[PDB]
Amino acid sequence: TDSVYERLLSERIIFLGSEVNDEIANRLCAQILLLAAEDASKDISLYINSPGGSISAGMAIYDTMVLAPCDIATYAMGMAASMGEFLLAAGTKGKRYALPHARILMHQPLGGVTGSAADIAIQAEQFAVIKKEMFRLNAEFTGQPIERIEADSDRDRWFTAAEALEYGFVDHIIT
Amino acid sequence: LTDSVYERLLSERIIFLGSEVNDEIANRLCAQILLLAAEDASKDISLYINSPGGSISAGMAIYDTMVLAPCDIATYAMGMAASMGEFLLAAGTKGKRYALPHARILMHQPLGGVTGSAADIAIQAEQFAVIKKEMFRLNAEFTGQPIERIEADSDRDRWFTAAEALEYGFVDHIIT
Amino acid sequence: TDSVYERLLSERIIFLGSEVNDEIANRLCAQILLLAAEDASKDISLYINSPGGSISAGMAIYDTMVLAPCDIATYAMGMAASMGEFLLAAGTKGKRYALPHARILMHQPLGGVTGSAADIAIQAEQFAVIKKEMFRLNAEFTGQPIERIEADSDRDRWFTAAEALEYGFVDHIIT
Amino acid sequence: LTDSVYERLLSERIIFLGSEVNDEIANRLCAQILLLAAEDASKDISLYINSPGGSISAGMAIYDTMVLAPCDIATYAMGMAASMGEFLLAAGTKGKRYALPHARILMHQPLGGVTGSAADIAIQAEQFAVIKKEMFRLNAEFTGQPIERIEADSDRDRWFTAAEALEYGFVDHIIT
Amino acid sequence: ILPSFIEHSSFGVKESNPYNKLFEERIIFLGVQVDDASANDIMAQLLVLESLDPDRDITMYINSPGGGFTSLMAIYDTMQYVRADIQTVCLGQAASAAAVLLAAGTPGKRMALPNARVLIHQPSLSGVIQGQFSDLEIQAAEIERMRTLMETTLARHTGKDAGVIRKDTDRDKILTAEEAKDYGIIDTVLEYRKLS
Amino acid sequence: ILPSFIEHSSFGVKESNPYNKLFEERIIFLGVQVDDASANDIMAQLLVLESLDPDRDITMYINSPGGGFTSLMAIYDTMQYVRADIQTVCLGQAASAAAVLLAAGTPGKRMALPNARVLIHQPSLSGVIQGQFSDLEIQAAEIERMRTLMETTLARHTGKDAGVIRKDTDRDKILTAEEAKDYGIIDTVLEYRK
Amino acid sequence: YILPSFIEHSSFGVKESNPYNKLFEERIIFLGVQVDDASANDIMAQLLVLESLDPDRDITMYINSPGGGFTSLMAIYDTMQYVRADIQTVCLGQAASAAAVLLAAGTPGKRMALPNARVLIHQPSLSGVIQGQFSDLEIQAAEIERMRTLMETTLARHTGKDAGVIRKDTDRDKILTAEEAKDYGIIDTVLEYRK
Amino acid sequence: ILPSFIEHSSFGVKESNPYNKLFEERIIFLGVQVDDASANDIMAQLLVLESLDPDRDITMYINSPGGGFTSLMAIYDTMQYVRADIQTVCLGQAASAAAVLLAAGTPGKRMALPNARVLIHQPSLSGVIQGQFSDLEIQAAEIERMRTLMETTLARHTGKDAGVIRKDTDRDKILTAEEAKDYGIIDTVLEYRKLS
Amino acid sequence: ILPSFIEHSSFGVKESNPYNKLFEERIIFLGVQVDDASANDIMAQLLVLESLDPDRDITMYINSPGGGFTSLMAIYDTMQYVRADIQTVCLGQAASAAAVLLAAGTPGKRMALPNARVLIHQPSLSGVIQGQFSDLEIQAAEIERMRTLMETTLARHTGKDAGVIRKDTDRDKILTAEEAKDYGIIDTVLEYRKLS
Amino acid sequence: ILPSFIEHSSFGVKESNPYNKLFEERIIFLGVQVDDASANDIMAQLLVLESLDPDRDITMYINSPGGGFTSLMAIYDTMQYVRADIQTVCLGQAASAAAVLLAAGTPGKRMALPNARVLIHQPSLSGVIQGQFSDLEIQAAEIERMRTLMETTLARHTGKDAGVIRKDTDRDKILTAEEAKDYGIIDTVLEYR
């Protein structure tokens, strides 16, 4: 089982196949660092079957994709939701794919507050910063106006592969 | 080592769906089909299925990866192929869907849960309706039956013997 | 798997990806020791995606970084918090980086008191010592005043990659 | 694997006490010292300590094996050497006891428990008084302090910075 | 702990405690979560005060975080069906279902102490309810009918039209006693009647 | 909490509580889950009120999620054996077993408050029963007998055919008070008397 | 809570009682829980007090029960038959396992059931597991069969069936409707609704 | 673990226990954590004592670690609404919400035993509450309104400017009985009245 | 099962239990661990015994392992404020907090039975309390104030200087009744009054 | 379940239960474990009974497996302080702290039923207590003083020397009713009436 993921890593294919945590994000950023060192002009394919996960873990993966010399193809296999939708849509323009029966979900961040009323206010201050920046980035990726992103993302919004192409999450549907 | 037989079988282009269908098994299996298509895009891949079912999302990673592969995917129902296993069997390449003689097929409609607010639950319910329409359409394609019969049979669990599964269209052949 | 991180050690790159505990800390000091033995002039690049952790564990890594012959480059991916911020700021000056959307968190130490009235008195003595010493050190890394480290750190202060660069945690932001 | 780094360092004659000192780390650790003295009995062994303390029985296993080894044992206080960590750092070969600059050393007296019948507890309590006297004597030999100060400072936890530890006698040098 | 006290008149000595004494003045306390027990006990109290005397008012004090939905409409229906007027008073807080019950008081007799807060949000489901899609489609349909029933009955007692209630309860909406009067949940804010 | 109140007459001072007062006026409250205990509690209440006066009506208020099946049929057989009429009132909900008991009141005296909901669904089993198949065949048969008794006794009182009941309860069916009267489960929706 | 009290009044005085005291007042015992050691003694004490208060009048046992242990059955059973007073049994809802034996042990002509009651008959089961040396389990296994054949012959005595038949009907559980329980010999009459 | 005792007069023999007797003398005891139950129990008590005699004082003994916030303001609004004056006494401790309750006593009638301590800090949330940011954004707004309300009512009774309170309640502040008098939380520190 | 007994006089037949009879003769029992429940129950009893008659002594039997601190000082300040004198009597044990109370009984009426033991130690915290250092530094400061308030009130009542208490309580110090007398914690060791 | 009964006289009718009647005849029951609660209940019972009439005997029935140490010594010192004589009777068992109470009854009024057993052993600690050695050295010393106080106060009532108690309690020592009389714990073994 990890013998397949290594045989595929030699062919420049990597998976984001679970929930996005520091651990999957770090094994993944390391895999992109290695793969750009072996060859910095061949693309990397990142297949995504993910329900979401930490925004902080996803910015490591997201920043690492972008600084890569080479292109990152993203493929939506089955489902890429929330932070998975973010990383699919962050793939290099023109090289974001959706399989035909994949599903894309977009929604706003979730979290918790705890502590004193002064600590919670700080927590909320970051809630707003984080919310505005993630919609801006979704806005850049999809071509939609920021106003529609904030609006559609108020509660879970599902897209089929076909509607995901209209919205701007992907560039092609593989056949 | 159990994974020692599965890897030697990988060299023979045999792959197994032997557990409940979750992201973890689906991700390994989509990986394997990619590899086997990279090694050879003209020899078939044989997919043995003994599964009770599992996540539709994970099943559609598998299903699309089957369909888009260059080579054919033969599917064999050993023991039991139920729910999403039933779908993936019937989704094999036409002519290359097998049931072993005492295997069983179970077909039924989707299960899930609702949670959240009244507005959040309304959305969940919208997807219930789509998903069920979209899954019945695909089972109706595989088997050739009318959507109207797929929906009616799938309301509550309908079991098939290897033979009944062949008259219905889930499989194309029974192995002897 | 584990081998992705090992291939990266061959390239003189190491990760601090989890909470900083005695276990990550020790393996990390060992790694820096080996890498200074293999070559005592080539950099060590230390990537940080860490929520923070134990000071004593963290001060092992810090002491080993500083005494190592080669320089230690620090890169903040996604999130560098608490000891993560300290170990990022402690990298060799001029060679402290933040990826564009990483965040840095700086705040004061946490712990517990327990035991007799006299034992807690001892505990609180070390709280003051520890805090004054960790603040002096952040002030050296950032160049800010002790005045401002203590006050900003009283409750969590988040910095975005740019805010951190003005404050002195890093020297650059990658593109 | 983490263990692959600890072996690459064993070839360089470096061993770590990176955790609580219990019997297991103590046995792996005495074994590492027997190996390293069998390979070459004239080269030093460097013992890095980042440890919170632990069992005295397991810790006297480590101490005797340090002192009986043919080669010297240099000790490094990384980050933290407390309780049996403090004893083992300070028991390093005189002149080769080091502190990293921001390490801390903790010194205090034994901790433990009593249970059972009134006679059993009397026995537990004799060993306490012995064990307490033997450790202070040893720490007084290591540090140069009078027994009277070891006992007074150790009643309750006494913390030292690397610099304070050198004045007190736990180490011989601060690395820079 | 909860003391008893003793009252006296020429007829006899009575031992009673603070909640019976409130009830003796036709005052019901709604101060736990509206669950199924809570609901039955409160209808029984309402119905009893209706029988003892239908021409005197009943008063309901409310310090409640809300409660179940079928439990709400039972209490609600009993409140309207009873012949007697109902004074509702919110001390401290009336949330979710409890908020609807404060507004369901007879007009002019709905009030709240000044530092009370009133929260309104649309039915939620803390649990998960599981099933074949056929079954969840049915519950999902009823959950929506329950939501609109909360929104039209609020519209009836507050004067806001239903369409605003739905915009207002999409996310929780906290109102101070004063905000709660302008909205139309209560009619008066109690002034501190204390000399100081 | 649940306070008690004190009543006074030329005869004596009487202290009682809200459920005692309701029982004094021939009202039984069925407002929890129908289990074996609750059911025995209700039968004892029914039989006792039949003893004090069989020519006067007993009222059962119902805000109940329903309950076991043999528990239902004890309560039901008792309601029908007693000579005194039974008025049923659904205050919040009468679901599953409880909806059958609402319908089983004496005709013309079955009612609901306006916003009450009625649920009808066929016997379920939330647990799991396991055994040799020979054991499960027997139980599976009785679960079918129990299902078809609910469908035939609901029919006797709603006036529908048992086959209609059996299809309406294939999947759960929620009904508003007015729809419960149309269906035949109750006779009137109570209007606010205020 | 769930069970109110009521008040009866006469020229003698005012009496406060509750639904089970009123019922006990009329010589009615309620057997409506699981028969454990507690339930059984509570029921024997009730049977014996009622025999003391008046041995010439009937006792009624209302039964809605899923059964219980064996020695608790045989205690309750033995008391029903020892007491001089006649015992009328009435099954509402259910009488299963051990409870079905006591329904049948009422005095003949006076065992009855409401029409939608179900009656269950099965042989003793042991849901626990009891462990030991093979020698001890051989003894326990022996007594467990004595229990089965004793349940089977006393069932036979009151129904008029033969024990070789009882033993066949109970190999697997046998559910009986009120009518089927009359034909089997467990009750004598099925109450018709008197509305 | 609590005796009952028996009092006698020409009129009758009365059995009561120590808190009942205390209630008889218009003393309410607030010595558990202020939760929602506790809070109703204390309003019920305040109102009954106001009913029995509105011109005679109510005394609240306070040895309490505080409690919820909507429960705080309920008791507070009742304290201020009732016509009877309220004398507050801090035995041993009055912290968090309970320290505001001590201060809201009618002026001149706030006291503390000599070794009583009074703690004041800003509302904290010991659990975690979870959701969409839109939901947590709303809770955080109400949690801040809760803090400024605790600070302006504290300012109203202590005479401090509310901006000072907010700085002092940033971190916990322990006050001895006397420090509380200077701060403005109480008016008098009881002298021991013992001859020995 | 704690028996009840019956007393009789020309006035009436009275049923009470051992703790009621002890209370009737003004003996309060402090024989559990002093938590906030316990402390309120004892403060209430003290205040009640002062109301029935302040010119009679109150006795506190003590067989207690001690308990929390703010509960100690609540009880302490009441005992001193009450006008009545207080007899403290140790049966079995008075440890930690409980021994401050034994010493704080009014002078001459502090006693202990012969095999009673008195244990004295400085406040301990068995839990772990957690936070930012800024908060623990605050907590820590009060724990030391508490420590020295114990050293000073014991000294007031044993006649020792606080600086000696602080040494004796650094590690636990067990005292026999006679050694407790010598220390100044009690005034007499009871002699057995048997005619055998 | 424990019945209540009704006794009657020309004055009035009294309802009580079997332990109230036993208390009415000056019989205290010590039939549980001696913990701090149990000890406080018995001290109140003993002190009350001394208040109702100091010139009459108190009887302590004992079928108790023992209990804590400071709860023994409160009970013991109360028993010895009260003016009334205390008769002790061992019904089933009196072990550990409880045998000390059997023996501490007033001389001549200590008895046991024939099949009662008496167990004597030195204090045990079923828990564990943890701490610095300085703190464990103190507890360990108090625990030894406790052992020897049990050995000397037993020595006071049995007539054995304290040194033998200490030899005999090193390991548990179980005694029959007759053997308890020779040891000196009880004075007579009750003859069946």
Ligand SMILES: COc1cc2c(Oc3ccc4[nH]c(C)cc4c3F)ncnc2cc1OCCCN1CCC(c2ccc(C(N)=O)cc2)CC1
């Ligand atoms: C994931 O941790 C956290 C991440 C944070 C964080 O990251 C970044 C970094 C760079 C970033 N660049 C950009 C453009 C955005 C952006 C970002 F956003 N930036 C600011 N502050 C954070 C706080 C966290 O919290 C941590 C305590 C431990 N902790 C974890 C999870 C908790 C929780 C609670 C409830 C659910 C749930 N359903 O209820 C899940 C988790 C509760 C407490």
Ligand SMILES: COc1cc2c(Oc3ccc4[nH]c(C)cc4c3F)ncnc2cc1OCCCN1CCC(c2ccc(C(N)=O)cc2)CC1
């Ligand atoms: C597998 O997760 C989920 C999958 C979903 C999903 O997938 C796809 C993807 C591509 C697809 N292409 C096609 C043609 C169909 C199709 C698809 F359908 N598409 C839409 N929406 C989904 C929601 C899910 O759920 C998530 C919320 C949280 N959540 C609460 C309770 C849950 C639960 C689950 C099982 C049981 C049980 N036995 O009680 C109870 C509860 C599960 C999850």
Ligand SMILES: COc1cc2c(Oc3ccc4[nH]c(C)cc4c3F)ncnc2cc1OCCCN1CCC(c2ccc(C(N)=O)cc2)CC1
């Ligand atoms: C990290 O351990 C500890 C480290 C300590 C320590 O280290 C150093 C070393 C070199 C250092 N150079 C510099 C500049 C600072 C500096 C340093 F500071 N120097 C002094 N004294 C310490 C006490 C500790 O505590 C240990 C007791 C056992 N223990 C109790 C509770 C604990 C706890 C409790 C609650 C959480 C939580 N969320 O509640 C986490 C832990 C953890 C451990």
Ligand SMILES: COc1cc2c(Oc3ccc4[nH]c(C)cc4c3F)ncnc2cc1OCCCN1CCC(c2ccc(C(N)=O)cc2)CC1
């Ligand atoms: C560490 O085992 C034990 C080691 C002992 C031991 O070893 C040596 C050997 C050579 C030695 N040369 C020198 C100079 C000292 C010296 C030594 F000392 N020599 C004497 N006697 C010992 C008793 C032990 O104890 C075992 C009881 C069972 N038991 C275990 C742990 C317990 C415990 C309790 C509380 C914590 C609390 N926080 O943690 C942890 C443990 C309590 C009871």
